[PDB]
Amino acid sequence: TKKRRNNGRAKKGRGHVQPIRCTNCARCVPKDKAIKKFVIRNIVEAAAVRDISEASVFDSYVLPKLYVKLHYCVSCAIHSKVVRNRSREARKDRTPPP
Amino acid sequence: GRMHAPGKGLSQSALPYRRSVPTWLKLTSDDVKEQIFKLAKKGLTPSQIGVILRDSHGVAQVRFVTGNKILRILKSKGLAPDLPEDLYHLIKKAVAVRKHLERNRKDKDAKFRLILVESRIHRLARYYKTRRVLAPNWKYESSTASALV
Amino acid sequence: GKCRGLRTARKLRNHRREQKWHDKQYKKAHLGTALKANPFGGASHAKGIVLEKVGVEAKQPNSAIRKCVRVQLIKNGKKITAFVPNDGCLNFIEENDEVLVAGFGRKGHAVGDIPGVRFKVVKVANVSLLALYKGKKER
Amino acid sequence: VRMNVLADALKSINNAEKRGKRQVLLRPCSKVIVRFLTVMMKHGYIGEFEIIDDHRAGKIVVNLTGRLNKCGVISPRFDVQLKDLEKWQNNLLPSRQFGFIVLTTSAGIMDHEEARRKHTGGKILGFFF
Amino acid sequence: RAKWRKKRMRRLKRKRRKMRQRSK
RNA sequence: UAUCAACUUUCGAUGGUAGGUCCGUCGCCUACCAUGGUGACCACGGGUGACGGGGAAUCAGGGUUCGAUUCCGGAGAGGGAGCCUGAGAAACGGCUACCACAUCCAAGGAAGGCAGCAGGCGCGCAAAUUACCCAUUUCCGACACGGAGAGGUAGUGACGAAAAAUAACAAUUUGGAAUGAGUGCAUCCCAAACCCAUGGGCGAGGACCCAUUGGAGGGCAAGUCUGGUGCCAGCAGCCGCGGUAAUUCCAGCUCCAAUAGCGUAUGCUAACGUUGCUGCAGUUAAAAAGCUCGUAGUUGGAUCUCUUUACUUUGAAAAAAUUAGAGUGUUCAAGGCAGGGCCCCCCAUUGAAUACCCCAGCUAGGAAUAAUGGAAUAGGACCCCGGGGCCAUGAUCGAGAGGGACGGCCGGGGGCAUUCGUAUUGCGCCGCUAGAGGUGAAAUUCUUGGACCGGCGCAAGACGGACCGGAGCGAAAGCGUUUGCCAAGAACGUUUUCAUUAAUCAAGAACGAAAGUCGGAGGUUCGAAGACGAUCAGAUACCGUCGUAGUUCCGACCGUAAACGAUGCCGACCCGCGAUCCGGCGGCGUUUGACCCGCCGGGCAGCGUUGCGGGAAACCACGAGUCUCUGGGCUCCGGGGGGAGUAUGGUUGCAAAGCUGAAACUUAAAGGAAUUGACGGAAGGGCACCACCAGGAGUG
RNA sequence: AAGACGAUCGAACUCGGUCGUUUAGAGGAAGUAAAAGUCGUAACAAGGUUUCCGUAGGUGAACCUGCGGAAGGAUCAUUA
Ligand SMILES: [Zn+2]
């Protein structure tokens, strides 16, 4: 039976999209079917940002961040706990989790 | 829907219920004929004849003032060609497509469109033959059509 | 959808003509096959000579030795397996004698827990097997 | 692309009647459609329809009274005689008490009871009950 | 896997052609 | 029946001329000439358990099947061929041959055709008596007379059909009372006999003058009855019954649709709307060709007193029988076409009819629908008198169909050439050092021949990220770095132009991801194959190192994908809202088109209601709605699951294989959707010193 | 009258071509029905390497892998 109206991808009005590669498994995943995850984290951890702050030779220097664009396949986005298996009625919620 | 194209677009003319001529038009039945004559001899198709008259001289429907349309006027005088201008541009497009295919060989979309252009030519000529407006021996040949443009 | 046009009597007739062949019960009765492969050749009964007395084992989940006989037809020389219907009537079967076999219920289909036997013997030695089972026509 | 104007006419009436509408707009008009509505209006299934007299195919706005159950066409227009007219009555009408089959005899468009009284058959257009 | 039933079938048909080719 | 697509003639195939021939026409034949005739509207070829029809069976309607079979027509007399006679035969219950078969011979010869009536053999599942007679019915001749196995009658006959016993009236078991079936005489009947039918006579109380056939678990009306048989024997069309308390089987009783019939096998019909024209299905159960073009075929926008076709009505025709069916008490009925009553009249010189007979042709109306068609260089309609006059002098459009022009565009549409960005990999130099690669772990491998790592670099080949979205474009496959070149396309705009030029489409064709194939270049990375390293009981794998073909480009092939929206195209109708895409339109503003509020037209989609419908449900407004209230048009395609996309044939291809495509046989399920449990090596939450943390005892 | 030339119709026979149809065959290779015996675990829960399509190669065996797909996936969703 058809589990999702969009078949688990964002292909509407098209016949084929460019496949991209995953991150933790390097699997060819379509661009619209990829599990996008824009990771933006500091270069230094919050537990070690104070040691780098006092060692900074300047007065006020904002530590930059790691802007990483990750792609996950369905089999890995669930194993990595990026996405979960929701209820039959909960799958229709396209709102990003807070 | 379109003949050899998808989509069911609706963009055409709507003639109003007024089967008359607006009073603010000062061009008589003979003055408009001279405008069609002076421009058809200049190398302008009847499709281009009504455009310039509508947009510069303000013509609405020559079929109301005159008992005949632009086609039956130029043919009664002898200023319009034998083959209609609609089929003329159908052959002109195929010439550009053929010349495009002669340089670019692996353009499959241009070759696909070439069949559609010719398909409308044969369907139109099939209506031309049964209407006695074209000779029954008239046949579109892609080799000899280059000089017809 | 189906063509409903007033001049589509030929299109409708030829379509139904070629689609009836996709029916199993129609194609088996309107082709050379299923008639020449049929040992009876389109007959209800047939006579034959008892060649062997073979006991075929029933299929799962049943367990019982179905008593049949390997009979060779006289009309075309084909060898079939007629099932001895009643109980203990296999002993009433004589060796190398004439038996009038007939179909076994379903037409050309094995009946019950028997694997492939689709024939049953009606008469034995020019007399009915049912009488031999009910103490009549002592032969 | 149309292949029938009476089919799209009675299809618009049948849908608007079931949707509870009081008036239905029929985009194409024709003398066969107008005489078809007259047979229904004469028997009390539709109201007074107004023909929009345009210099084109023409439009018709029918006043629906809700008394109609369904109006449909029989495509193609089969040739119905008088000996087989009783057959079409059992296949298209709900019962022998009501419902009419619109035939096109040589005397014009009429129902099946009028064609039997006039003792003449013709081509069948549709039905209504 | 129905695809390997098609893989073994094309492999059996290809062998039947070689047996039928040597009987020419 | 296309796994028969082209066919017919170097001997007639089509037509033309003349002639021959025959009763007569004709390529019927001959001769001279033409290159014709038929064909996707299915010719030709093949098959038929094919004589055709009238009809039969079954059917609500529509249909399906059957028709050797007594009537009509045709065909044949073992297979052919050729003749005689006659008005009529290519006759065979007449000949002449050959072929097949076979009889009598004295061995020289002669004589044979039961698919006529009986009968025999054979064949088989399958089908009567070497019977009696020209009376009916009629037929043949010289005919009142004679002849008829044509026919009539009887025997055999459970093909089948119509009537109709095995009691009844009583009693609480015995009384008569009523009648044949059977059994024996006349008469009738019959050409004689025979079955009857009739008159009396002889004729039943366990009225023994006796009814069986499948059943009794369910479907499906009838017993947890009785006993043994114990997954054995068996029962069972299907599901299923037996592994020592069987409602199934092996038997009794009893009971049940029954019934002089009743089971079984097979064909066929309904059941079956599981062949669907009426009237089915193709999102997920079997299924819309990957996509588009395209002829034949099929169906085609609106517009005319409210030239010929198709269509409807009427009559003759549209054999009889049969059927429907008026009429008639064959004791009734199946049937028959014949008879109730008054002493030679009386159903008014007793009957008595009719319908149906499809289709086609024929006969007399109507003019709705759908075609067709009369005037555009008017050889125009009429009247004049080959010149004029005369007419309202002759062209409907402007599709909520389409083509094209044209304007501003728009878009990953396509071809080709350039620009750029790195990265991976390879190499050189500079700098420091011993491990590095990789893995869950390990090892292969690279390494003081400087690996890995850092910089400056260099070279080659792929790729074109993030922007990039449930956004666009294209018929689909598919398409996103810059710039340039090239010719297309939808939508929108339009009082432009053309004026039904259409839609869908067997046959045919373009294109068609990837892999593969042939021929070159280039081979970075990846990487079929392959080697090796690990793991395991075993890995010919996943993991790792390395790497051929391949992956990249160029041309010719291959035409296959879960080519999917698992959902054909066109058209109408049928809900709402907020967004989004292109174009157009009109409105406060902000900003030098951008943004804001709307609206009209298509495009991808979404949400809500489907509890205005649909569906098995999941779900469906790119309808999967307007479907028993069934018919808008068209194409393709499905008929339980397997066998099997196999065999074979044709065909395409270099090959791999593509298209087309079976059967035997096997099977009672396969499958779809949904639900409750269980389970997961899935996720989440929660709980207990038989968990840990913190320790404390003790075990080992 | 027998008989004979020639023409014509033409059975039939001896050889061939073609079509239809019916059958033998050493051997080879499948299908189905049995018992499910051996081997391994391919699939069904993340079936323990997600499944599956097309294609190709390889492998005792189910299968493995590459390339391009599809969700009938365990994702209808992942943030300026
Ligand atoms: Zn991935």
Nucleic strand G contact set for A 28-47 (CB, < 7 Å):
28-30, 33, 35-38, 40
Q: Do B19 and D55 touch (CB under 8 A)?
A: yes
CA D65, CA D68: separation in Å to the nearest integer?
7
CA C51, CA C94: separation in Å to the nearest integer?
10
CA C64, CA A70: separation in Å to the nearest integer?
68
What are C123's strand-pairing partners? C100, C128
CA D5, CA D15: separation in Å to the nearest integer?
16
Structure tokens at B51: 């455009």
Side chain identity, residue A55: A
Supply angle C-alpha D65, D67, D72, rounded to 5. Answer: 105
CA C17 to chain CA centroid, Å, is 29
CA C101, CA C80: separation in Å to the nearest integer?
10
Please classify residue A81 by burial: count the beta carbons closer than 10 Å to its beta carbon, then call 0-12 exposed, 13-18 middle and 19+ buried: exposed
Q: How far is the CA of A98 from the centre of ligand 1 (A)?
A: 24
Structure tokens at D99: 């419902």
Dihedral angle at the C-alpha atoms of D87, D91, D94, D95, nearest 10 degrees? 20
Go through chain A and tell me how many residues it has.
98
Q: Are C88 and C79 a contacting pair, CB within 8 Å?
A: no
Q: Is C129 helix (H, G, I), strand (E, B) or coil?
A: helix
Q: Do D1 and B1 touch (CB under 8 A)?
A: yes
Structure tokens at B101: 């295919």
Resolution of this entry in Å? Answer: 2.4
Bridge pairing between strands C55-57 and C65-73: antiparallel
Establish if B16 touches chain D: CB-CB under 8 angstroms. no
Peptide bond into C61 cis (omega under 30): yes
State which residue has its Cα closest to the C1' atom of F477.
A15
Q: Is B1 helix (H, G, I), strand (E, B) or coil?
A: coil
Phi, psi of B7 (to 5 degrees): 80, 145
Structure tokens at B44: 């302008």
Phi, psi of A28 (to 5 degrees): -70, 105
Structure tokens at C20: 């009836």
Q: Are D126 and D79 a contacting pair, CB within 8 Å?
A: no
Q: Are B70 and B36 a contacting pair, CB within 8 Å?
A: yes
Q: Which residue has the tokens 């006695």?
A: B132
Number of H helices, E strands in chain B: 6, 0
Q: How many CB pairs under 8 A join C and D?
A: 6
Sign of the Cα torsion C64, C69, C73, C79 reads positive
Q: How far is the CA of A5 from the centre of ligand 1 (A)?
A: 21
Go through chain E and tell me how many residues it has.
24
Q: Are D39 and D106 a contacting pair, CB within 8 Å?
A: no
Q: Give the residue among D53, D55, D57, D63 at the shortest CA–CA distance from D25.
A: D63
CA C77, CA D30: separation in Å to the nearest integer?
76
Go through chain B and tell me how many residues it has.
149
CA A85, CA A91: separation in Å to the nearest integer?
8
Strand F close to B10 by CB, under 7 A: yes
Question: Subunits touching D (CB < 8 Å, at least 3 pairs)?
Answer: B, C
Side chain identity, residue C17: R
Phi, psi of A21 (to 5 degrees): -100, 145
- Spell out a b/e string for D53-64, using b for 16 or more CB atoms within 10 Å of the CB, else e: eeeeebebebeb
Nearest residue in D to C6, CA atom: D76
Which string of DSSP letters, residue by residue, matches A1-16?
----TTTTS--SS-S-
Side chain identity, residue D104: T
Q: How far is the CA of E4 from the centre of ligand 1 (A)?
A: 26
Supply angle C-alpha C70, C74, C77, rounded to 5. Answer: 70
CA C51, CA C71: separation in Å to the nearest integer?
5
Q: Give the residue among D49, D41, D93 at the shortest CA–CA distance from D67.
A: D41
Distances (CA, A) of B86 to A33, B142, D108: 48, 17, 43
CA C96, CA C48: separation in Å to the nearest integer?
9
What are C101's strand-pairing partners? C46, C121
Strand G close to A3 by CB, under 7 A: yes
Bridge pairing between strands C119-124 and C79-83: parallel
The enclosing H or E element of A35 equals strand A35-42
